């Protein structure tokens, strides 16, 4: 399996984050699902730190008894599509979402993610 | 035109259609918007009907507003189809983007699955 997108993933549970970001190609970027785009645009420069915040994120939901379950990893082409939840301790629902991956020359052009939202 | 009730369902909506769009989804398949309390909202079949003439009501206001929706293509893969879309103003700027993930059985729609990208 040579998809960046399964290295990425490898790379982040081994928590090497430098590997994980250079699967992204040098034009990538990382589209959060909310801001005013809508949405937000992290630039290549910018994945280093936000993956940071959200490994850090990820330790603290942990160690508060949350889990992250990730649906099965789609590929078709040049695209990836991952669904992925993070449950409480309890199985409430606080996140919901799904990535859409755009890949070039093996690397990850665009990760873009949309979310389920509470009102 | 596809046979694919995704397919299906769009036709009939251009078309004015909305029983027979309705009638893309299964007996017990569900239309789950991106917001709400789950997070999201599943809406049963029973009030499929009445929320598509609520949304179309709100497409043909867009629409004479202006605004444009512009969808990506159908991806299709083992039981399901993944299609962006996104809500373009006449000069292009984003109103709404997000991705709908249909899960398909026996040539209808089981789930409809919205999601989006928010403004905060
Ligand atoms: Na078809």
Known sequence: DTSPVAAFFA????????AAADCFAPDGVWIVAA???????????????FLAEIIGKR????????????????VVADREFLEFRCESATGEVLER???V???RDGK??????????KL
């Open 35 to 49: 801001g005013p785009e809508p949405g937000h645009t992290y630039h290549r420069k910018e994945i280093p730190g």
């Open 59 to 74: 330790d603290e939901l942990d160690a508060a008894g949350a889990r992250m379950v990730y649906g099965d990893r789609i």
């Open 97 to 99: 979402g799904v990535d």
């Open 108 to 117: 990850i052009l665009v990760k873009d993610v949309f979310r389920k939202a």
């Open 101 to 103: 991956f755009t890949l």
């Open 11 to 18: 790379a982040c549970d081994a928590d090497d984050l430098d």
